[PDB]
Structure formats: structure tokens, C-alpha cells
């Protein structure tokens, strides 16, 4: 309720400022699309990666090391595949 109250105050002051700001007068490109899906897939691999530092204290350090390097290596390999296959040209 602390941060709910703060969030609500931000919303109310922003609406107050908007109402003061308002009341006082009164074909495409295919290359656009690949950027979005490239972001979407690398952002999903981000979503897998980023809870790593919570995990970084285990007793099976070798397994965590190997699968962590597997994840980043696959991310770089997908980058390498679109790199060799001219995936972001312009």
C-alpha cells in the first residue's frame, strides 16, 4: 500500500499536469520485421539467462558452468547463423 499509494500519486499528479496542459486553451519493409523477431528470440534467451546469479551458489558447480556456457554459446551461435546467412542486411 506504500508503493500502491506512490503509484497512484504519480498517476494523479500526471493527470493533473495533463489536464492543466489541455484545459487552458479550452507498404513496409521486410527488414523492419526481422529486427522485432530477432529481438524477441534473443530477449527470450535473456529471460532464460538472467536468474543465473541467484543460482550461482550450488554444490554441482561443473554442471552449472557447463549449461551456462551452453546457453550463451547457443545465443552466440544463433547470432552467428544469422550473421553468416546475412540475416540483418540493409
Amino acid at each position: 500500500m506504500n508503493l500502491m499509494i506512490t503509484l497512484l500519486t504519480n498517476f494523479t499528479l500526471a493527470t493533473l499536469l495533463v489536464t492543466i496542459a489541455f484545459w487552458l486553451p479550452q507498404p513496409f519493409s521486410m527488414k523492419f520485421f526481422l529486427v522485432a523477431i530477432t529481438f524477441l528470440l534473443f530477449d527470450l534467451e535473456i529471460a532464460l539467462l538472467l536468474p543465473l546469479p541467484w543460482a550461482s551458489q550450488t554444490t554441482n558447480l561443473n554442471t552449472m558452468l557447463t549449461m551456462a556456457l551452453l546457453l550463451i554459446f547457443l545465443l552466440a551461435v544463433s547470432l552467428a547463423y544469422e550473421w553468416t546467412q546475412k540475416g540483418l542486411e540493409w
Binding site: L40, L41, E45, W54, T59, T63, M64, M67, L74, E82
Partner: protein
């Protein structure tokens, strides 16, 4: 200003899903789905709630509706049916709220105890390591097979996307 804030936020959640299930213009739909995902994240962050909804808040509300609005803006661009279905969905919401409140139980095909419920809930037990965060801090010791097939399906999704969008 009272106890049943989970039920209240769940009412706003059902409001949002109805508000884009009435098939609007798709950017009105994207607005409604952003509001729906925000209050669902609020709900899960109210059931404690430390991590996982906020984790997906980046992804589902940080990496999905952006791409939907993107591909809506570069594809294409009031009516009685949309507004009528919205009002009737709101009416079914109103009727289900009424049968929760002024009765004992509600059955669709279940039995739901009709009262706002903090129950069930933890009895203040000593975690000290924030249980769901260490649950997500699995997949990296025990999770051998799962991240292997997950990253593999990610790589196959990459090559599939580029091939369908004209490899090469």
C-alpha cells in the same frame, strides 16, 4: 480500502480480458492486453510474489506487445457488435459478482466458496531464502534436460523464422 484486494484485482483482470475479447481495433486490443498483464502481475506479486510475475513483466509486457504493436503498425489499420458484446460480458461479470457476494457458493462446474479469501496462506514460516527465487535458482543445477531442449527449440525457432521470412 478493505481486505479482498485479490478479488478486486481479479475483477479488473476479467474486465481487461473482456475489453479486448470484444474484438476491437487491434491497437485498442493491445492497450487492453497491457492493462490485463499489469494487473495479473499485480495479483501474482500479491500472492508473494517476490520474483516471478515481475520476471515475466519484462517479457510478456516488455517483449511481446511491443512486437504486436510493431507488426500492427506496419501491416494495416463505434460498431454495435463490439460495444454490445462488451456490455453483455460486463453484465455476466456483474451477475457473477452478485452471486459470489449475496450467496454461499458458486458453481460453474466446481464448488467455489463464496467469500474473499486470504486462505490458504503461509503461517509466517521461516524461509530466509525466498522460496520461489530459489526455485527459479534451479534449472541450472538439476535442470539438465530442460534448458537443453529449450535452447534447442529457441535455435530452431530462429532458423524457422528466417527461412519463412525468406531464407536467404
Amino acid at each position: 480500502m478493505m481486505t479482498y484486494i485479490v478479488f478486486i484485482l481479479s475483477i479488473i483482470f476479467v474486465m481487461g480480458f473482456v475489453g479486448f475479447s470484444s474484438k476491437p481495433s487491434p491497437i485498442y486490443g493491445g492497450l487492453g492486453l497491457i492493462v490485463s498483464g499489469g494487473v495479473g502481475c499485480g495479483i501474482v506479486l500479491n500472492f508473494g510474489g517476490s520474483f516471478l510475475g515481475l520476471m515475466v513483466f519484462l517479457i510478456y509486457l516488455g517483449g511481446m506487445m511491443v512486437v504486436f504493436g510493431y507488426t500492427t503498425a506496419m501491416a494495416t489499420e463505434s460498431n454495435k457488435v463490439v460495444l454490445g458484446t462488451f456490455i453483455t460480458g460486463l453484465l455476466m461479470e456483474f451477475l457473477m459478482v452478485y452471486y459470489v457476494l449475496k450467496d454461499k457458493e458458486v458453481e460453474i462446474v466446481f464448488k467455489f466458496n463464496g467469500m474473499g479469501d486470504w486462505v490458504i496462506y503461509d503461517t509466517g514460516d521461516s524461509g530466509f531464502f525466498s522460496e520461489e527465487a530459489m526455485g527459479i535458482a534451479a534449472l541450472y543445477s538439476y535442470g539438465t534436460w530442460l534448458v537443453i531442449v529449450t535452447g534447442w527449440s529457441l535455435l530452431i525457432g530462429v532458423v524457422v523464422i528466417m527461412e519463412i521470412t525468406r531464407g536467404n
